[PDB]
Design a protein around this ligand. Structure first.
Ligand SMILES: Nc1nc2c(ncn2[C@@H]2O[C@H](COP(=O)(O)OP(=O)(O)OP(=O)(O)O)[C@@H](O)[C@H]2O)c(=O)[nH]1
Ligand SMILES: [Mg+2]
Lengths: 21, 95, 49, 48, 31, 360, 13, 707, 14
RNA sequence: UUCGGGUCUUGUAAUUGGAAUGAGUACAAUGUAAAUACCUUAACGAGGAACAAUUGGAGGGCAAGUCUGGUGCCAGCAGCCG
């Protein structure tokens, strides 16, 4: 639509975490 | 709590050494200046001047290969937000 | 208007910078320059360290 | 201790010029040190 | 001649940097 | 190029003020009615010093030399040298640097070479013990003026090293409304290439005048002989009245001409010092422009200084009109409630001027 | 064996 | 130690502070206007329609507020209203959650110095189930507590029952923002600024008819003041945001239209408006004078006062004979110099000891101000402030206007000259016209060393010499930065991109501003091409200022060896002539393999070859390199955005990006295929055996021999 | 060295 | 701890299948002073099952990259920059 929903990145806000399993 | 006076060791060459990690802050309930460690030269970019850091103890158990003796405080937060949050890019430093 | 002619000459400078930024890089502005790539007998005048 | 993985990234090694593929296999430092060790061994036994 | 002058300049700046860092670490250890 | 000015008057002051503010100025009609109309060698050399110490600045000089146009830049400084033309001495070339010392990007280390005394301008001991305490009151801590070689008129050959390190942001405001109490009278009687009987006789004349007073009098002898005494012989004496409770100084000096009397010079300098004390209120008539400029460039706040109606002269009016034309900063004068004397407090709303060059 | 020697030198020092 | 802080200076008037300024911000259609009309009906009991422009109402006995509904789509409006604003009523849709525009505005506030943020949440009646509503409330509140501080309270609003939100929630919100209790900020307490309330052109219509609607017209601007006392002399430079950099031609203060009722009853008390209680104008219904008089010569000034060069330094004394005759005696300055008889002696000894000590430990200020260095510093601050206060209170006419200027909260008008026809024509009241008085450093123009990083939520990195529309100080303008690093603190080598997770230095041309100054820049301010991406591209601070930088881009010269011996090689295809080789001779050279060298002498018979001594036998296949440095320059571009001058006021378009001009001209991404990376597979080499000399093999002893 | 590092200059005319 | 010795269906960012379910949304009813929820339950609701849990600790590796010292080809510091 005309509304710009936010990214999953900036919604969840996990900045820089390593790789896990 | 303290005020950051000057970022020492900025004019050093070899990166990520302890004299580059060091800062010089003045504690506000004493007006008394003393040094403080900051991990990660990125976090050294985060702390600049007139910043109101929150020091804490160091609490090391063993030394390192290039550590400075007597630098007994480290930096926990800067300007109200946590250095680890700023480093991991959870938060943003508000001026 | 003065603003309008200023915007005209700004647009001219814009066109110049657009063409330069899309154009080819200078021989010295590149890296790993070879002798046949660069113009002949240039370093004596360019005077780099 | 306190290091990002993007800081720990990787750095690939580029290859020989394709215009100069007659002379093959642009040699890097690991190959150079192998070659130098073998030549040093030969020179030692020859001096003996 | 330029090679001579450049070597001299580099040695002067390296000596100045070394003296500056010695002074900074001295101030750290005494302050 | 925009703020216009007339006459060759207060030239170094106008250059200093335009360099501090940043407004481009244009001085015209510099000695029109002259056989040599236009500038002088020492004024041109002073502009060379300005452009040596600053950066990005443009000084246009008309081919007639009667119109100079200044578009200032930023202050950098650094370590360098300067060669004083023999028309004017190192005091005349030092005083603008005492204005522009602590607002730079790098520290000042300037080696001036030339004559070191005259009748009109400040000597080395005059500069030190008369104007270094004022900067130390305004916040500049690590300033110094070493004397490597001391020259004398009319051949000079002396060298002074001006070093300034206290790169302050802005001068702290000052609130001095009480007439200070002078504690001691220190002095320096110096000479070059003569017998120190002359220095001893100068100090004898000065103490002969000051024997009426009860405060302590300490005037140190300063003889220079050998290879670091410069070419010409000469002598001079400065006296400072030091108020040690607040760190204030009132100074007065002179040098001896060709064939004067050392005792007469000592008594004349002591008389001039007593006159300056009687006409003084918290500053001297020669430290006063430094104090006013520092109060105007202090941060956005009301500073107060107790001056005297004798210290209010035509030179004060001209200085204040120049400061109004540059900074648009009026100075308010209130008569103090004291009934005996006629002092007036000067209140200056110092504008926000920050040492914006210094990297953090 | 070489990896064990490296880890050994680290465990001595 | 929680209550300790960094000391700062609060330049607000204790006498008549101006209306606090609140910005109602948020997404396009999230009921951002209804909130204003209902909050105003709360504060003043009159329903209002067609709200446009700033609108000032009066709260309580001492407060008044200025509502600014920001236009929801224009990033420049977001930027300058975040520069000026003081309390931000940021409103978030409930059903939709956070939106990118709210997100971007919070980031520009965080970088330009955080005002008092306050969230309200709307459309909370559209939620079908109470448990989905409660969960979404908690989720919004906790993400909001991540961005703004934790514990930050946000309000919740139901549905618009009569063009108005519920009265109880509006009453709570009114009490909160009426005890909001703001805090000092550096930029706001260093500069004067205003938000222009009313706008008026000034020319003659005959002049307009003669010039043909092209003459730049005089402009009168009415509004309150804030921040720092604006100097009352005409001709100071002041930047109107989005219009340009003008200078004030004439200032005059006025009777303010909304006086707070405390001040109104105080004026009535001194003397001996209760219906009009809002203000939406864009909407409808002596030695001192002797010295400073210029026509008088200073000789005449001193002459009338009693009844010369400055290049000379010593003062003008008199004759030494007169001086000695006058100063035979010292009892005129003996005052300046320093049972009943016993009591007077003890008192004069006390005075002598008092002048001897002076100020050494006089209360020390420490036990006086309760044993905290912070309290000592702030007490010095407050003492200087009250001295300012009494010296201002001394005299009326000059100590209020000439000395300090118009303080703050003085409803002032100002006229400018040379203001564009585009501004006067396309002016619409839905946009803020804010004004900031500048400084010398902000009127200059040089290059700034900043340090900046890519924004964390921005996807793409920032290329060198890519235009960046940045906001630094009151100014927004696009420039061509260059992203540098120091190669371990030796030289400012330019990068080609931004390091994607840390700070790099940048240097760029543009109007200077002070050190330590935070700034932030976007790539696209034009609303017509935004997409779902995050707009804000770079955050940083500016550190220092110069007119030039010694900035290096590395270039390396390659050659190829074509004849090799032990430790020596003949190198070709690196230079063009023996003159060039002689210019570069004596060179620390190295090859890809990692062995060092030097070029030694120019070879004669070929034109460009030379001989070079290495440390070990170089292969033929390898490529020598010679690292050297080349100075680059900073492009001098500066294009300030003028959206308020523009008619559409969105979609301001300047220099496109490199990808955009490549796509528009239909070029291709330039890439030499010899420079890409491959996955090699290095084979194991079996070296040849040793071959002894035959003389040695003959002369070897019997046992130690090759059998 | 001087013409490499310095920037500002004097327009001396006579 | 070094020379080495011990032992065994192990290894896979390889392919693939149908079954199960509640986090969630929801008729409904119960609950309740009225609701919300729990406990019940139609209907939807799982292949990066992206319906995308963490907080700390130890360590390695890499370039035509950078800095410093050297008894070459090494060592140190380190490397988001080639
Ligand atoms: N149901 C409901 N409707 C709302 C709410 N808030 C606003 N609206 C609707 O949205 C409209 C009000 O939006 P505005 O106050 O104009 O918001 P705005 O920012 O001015 O919108 P623009 O004029 O597009 O800028 C009205 O028609 C309302 O019906 C809410 O909380 N609940
Ligand atoms: Mg609206």
């Amino acid at each position: 639509d005309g509304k710009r929903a936010i990214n999953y990145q900036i919604l969840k806000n996990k900045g820089l975490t390593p790789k896990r399993n | 709590k303290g005020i950051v006076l000057e970022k020492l060791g900025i004019e050093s060459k070899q990166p990520n050494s302890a004299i580059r990690k060091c800062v010089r802050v003045q504690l506000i309930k004493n007006g008394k200046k003393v040094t403080a460690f900051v991990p990660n030269d990125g976090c050294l970019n985060f702390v600049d001047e007139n910043d109101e850091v929150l020091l804490a103890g160091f609490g090391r158990k063993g030394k390192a290969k290039g550590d400075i003796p007597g630098v007994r405080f480290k930096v926990v937060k800067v300007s109200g937000v946590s250095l680890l949050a700023l480093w991991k890019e959870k938060k943003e430093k508000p001026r | 208007s003065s603003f309008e002619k200023q915007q005209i000459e700004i647009r001219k400078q814009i066109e110049q910078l657009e063409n330069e930024a899309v154009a080819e890089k200078k021989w010295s502005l590149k890296g790993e320059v070879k002798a046949k790539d660069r113009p002949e007998d240039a370093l004596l005048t360019e005077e780099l360290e | 201790k306190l290091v990002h993985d993007v800081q720990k990234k990787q750095h690939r090694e580029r290859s020989q010029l394709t215009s100069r593929s007659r002379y093959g296999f642009l040699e890097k430092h690991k190959d150079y040190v192998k070659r130098a060790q073998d030549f040093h061994r030969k020179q030692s036994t020859l001096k003996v | 001649f330029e090679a001579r002058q450049r070597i001299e300049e580099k040695n002067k700046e390296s000596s100045d940097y070394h003296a500056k860092m010695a002074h900074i670490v001295n101030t750290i250890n005494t302050e | 190029k925009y703020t216009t000015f007339q006459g060759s008057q207060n030239f170094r002051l106008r250059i200093v003020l335009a360099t501090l503010s940043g407004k481009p100025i244009k001085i015209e009609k510099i000695r029109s009615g002259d056989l040599n109309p236009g500038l002088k060698d020492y004024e041109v050399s002073f502009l060379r010093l300005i452009e040596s110490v600053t950066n990005g600045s443009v000084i246009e000089i008309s081919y007639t030399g009667t119109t100079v146009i200044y578009r200032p830049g930023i202050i950098v400084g650094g370590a360098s040298t300067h060669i004083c033309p023999s028309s004017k001495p190192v005091g005349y070339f030092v005083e603008p640097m005492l204005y522009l010392a602590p607002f730079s990007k790098k520290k000042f280390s300037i080696l001036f070479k030339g004559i070191t005394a005259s009748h009109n301008d400040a000597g080395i001991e005059a500069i030190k013990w008369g104007l270094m305490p004022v900067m130390e009151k305004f916040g500049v801590r690590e300033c110094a003026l070493h004397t490597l070689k001391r020259g004398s008129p009319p051949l000079g050959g002396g060298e002074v090293h001006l070093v300034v390190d206290s790169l302050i942001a802005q001068p702290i405001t000052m609130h001095e409304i009480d007439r200070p109490i002078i504690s001691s009278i220190t002095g320096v009687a110096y000479s070059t290439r003569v017998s120190p009987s002359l220095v001893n006789r100068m100090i004898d004349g000065a103490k002969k005048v000051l024997k009426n007073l009860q405060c302590e009098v300490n005037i140190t002898a300063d003889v220079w002989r050998g290879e670091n005494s410069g070419k010409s012989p000469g002598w001079g004496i400065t006296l400072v009245a030091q108020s040690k409770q607040k760190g204030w100084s009132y100074f007065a000096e002179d040098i001896g001409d060709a064939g004067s009397i050392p005792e007469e010079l000592g008594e004349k300098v002591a008389c001039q010092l007593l006159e300056e004390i009687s006409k003084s209120a918290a500053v001297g008539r020669n430290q006063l422009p430094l104090a006013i400029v520092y109060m105007v460039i202090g941060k956005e706040d009301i500073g107060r200084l107790r001056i005297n109606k004798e210290q209010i002269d035509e030179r004060f009016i001209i200085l204040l009109r120049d400061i109004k034309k540059i900074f648009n900063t009026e100075v308010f004068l209130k008569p103090v409630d004291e009934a005996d004397n006629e002092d007036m407090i000067a209140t200056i709303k110092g504008i926000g001027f920050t040492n914006t060059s210094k990297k953090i | 064996r070489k990896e064990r020697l490296k880890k050994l030198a680290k465990m001595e020092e | 130690e929680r209550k300790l802080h960094v000391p700062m200076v609060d330049r607000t008037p204790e006498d008549d502070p101006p209306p606090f300024i609140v910005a109602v911000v948020g997404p396009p259609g999230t009921g951002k206007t209804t909130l204003i009309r209902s909050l105003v009906r709360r504060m003043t009991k009159s329903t209002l329609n067609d709200i446009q422009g700033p609108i000032t109402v009066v709260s309580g006995k001492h407060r008044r507020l200025t509502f600014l509904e920001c236009p929801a789509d224009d990033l420049n409006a977001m930027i300058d209203i975040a520069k000026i604003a003081d309390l931000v009523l940021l409103l978030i849709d409930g059903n939709f959650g956070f939106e990118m525009e709210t997100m971007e505005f919070l980031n520009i506030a965080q970088h330009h110095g955080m005002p008092r943020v306050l969230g309200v949440a709307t459309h909370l009646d559209l939620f079908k189930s109470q448990s989905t509503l409660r969960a979404s409330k908690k989720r919004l509140k906790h993400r909001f507590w991540t961005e703004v501080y934790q514990g930050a309270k946000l309000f919740y609003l139901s549905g618009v029952i009569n063009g108005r939100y519920p009265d109880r929630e509006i009453l709570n919100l009114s009490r909160f923002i009426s005890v909001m209790k703001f805090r000092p900020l550096k930029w706001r307490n260093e500069h004067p600024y205003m938000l222009a309330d009313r706008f008026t052109d000034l020319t003659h219509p005959e002049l307009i008819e003669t010039q043909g609607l092209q003459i730049d017209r005089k402009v009168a601007i009415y509004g309150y003041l804030h921040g720092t006392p604006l100097p009352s002399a005409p001709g100071t430079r002041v930047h109107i945001a989005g219009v340009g950099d003008f200078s004030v031609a004439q200032i005059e203060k006025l009777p303010d239209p909304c006086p707070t009722p405390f001040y109104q009853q105080k004026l009535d008390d001194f003397e001996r408006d209760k219906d009009k209680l809002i203000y939406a104008p864009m909407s409808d219904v002596n030695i001192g004078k002797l010295i400073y008089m210029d026509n008088i010569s200073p000789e005449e000034c001193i002459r009338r006062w009693r009844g010369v060069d400055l290049e000379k330094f010593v003062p003008y004394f008199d004759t030494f004979e007169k001086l000695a005759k006058k100063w035979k005696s010292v009892d005129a300055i003996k005052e300046r110099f320093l049972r009943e008889m016993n009591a007077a002696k003890k008192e004069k000894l006390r005075a002598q000891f008092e002048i001897e000590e002076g100020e050494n430990f006089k209360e020390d200020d420490e036990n006086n101000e309760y044993d905290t260095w912070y309290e000592l510093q702030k007490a010095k601050i407050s003492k200087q402030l009250e001295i300012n206060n009494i010296e201002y209170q001394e005299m009326t006419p000059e100590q209020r206007q000439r000395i300090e200027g118009f303080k703050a909260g003085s409803y002032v008008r100002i006229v400018f000259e040379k203001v564009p026809m585009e501004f006067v024509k396309n002016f619409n009241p839905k946009f803020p016209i804010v004004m900031g008085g500048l400084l010398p450093t902000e009127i200059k123009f040089g290059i700034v060393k900043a340090r900046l990083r890519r924004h964390r939520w921005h996807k793409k990195i920032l290329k060198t010499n890519d235009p960046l529309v940045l906001s630094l100080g009151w100014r927004r303008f696009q420039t061509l930065p260059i992203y540098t690093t120091t190669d371990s603190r030796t030289r400012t080598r330019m990068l080609k991109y931004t390091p994607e997770h840390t700070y790099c230095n940048a240097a760029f041309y543009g109007p200077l501003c002070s050190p330590n100054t935070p700034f932030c820049g976007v790539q696209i301010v034009a609303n017509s091409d935004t997409g779902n991406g995050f707009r804000i591209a770079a955050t940083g601070i500016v550190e220092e200022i110069d007119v030039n930088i010694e900035i290096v881009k590395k270039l390396k010269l390659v050659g190829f060896p074509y004849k090799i011996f032990k430790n020596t090689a003949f190198i070709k295809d690196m230079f063009s002539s023996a003159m060039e080789v002689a210019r570069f001779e004596g060179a620390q050279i190295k090859t890809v393999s990692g062995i060092r060298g030097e070029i030694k002498r120019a070879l004669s018979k070929p034109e460009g070859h030379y001989r070079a001594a290495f440390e070990d036998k170089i292969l033929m296949s390898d490529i020598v390199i010679l690292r050297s440095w080349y100075p680059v320059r900073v492009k001098k571009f500066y294009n300030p955005v003028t959206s308020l001058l523009l008619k559409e006021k969105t979609e301001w378009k300047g220099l496109r990006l490199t990808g955009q001009i490549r796509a528009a001209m239909n070029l291709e991404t330039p890439s030499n295929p010899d420079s890409a990376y491959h996955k090699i597979e290095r084979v194991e080499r079996h070296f040849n055996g040793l071959k002894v000399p035959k003389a040695v093999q003959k002369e070897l002893p019997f046992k130690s021999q090759i059998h | 060295k001087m013409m490499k590092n310095k920037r500002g200059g004097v327009i001396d005319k006579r």
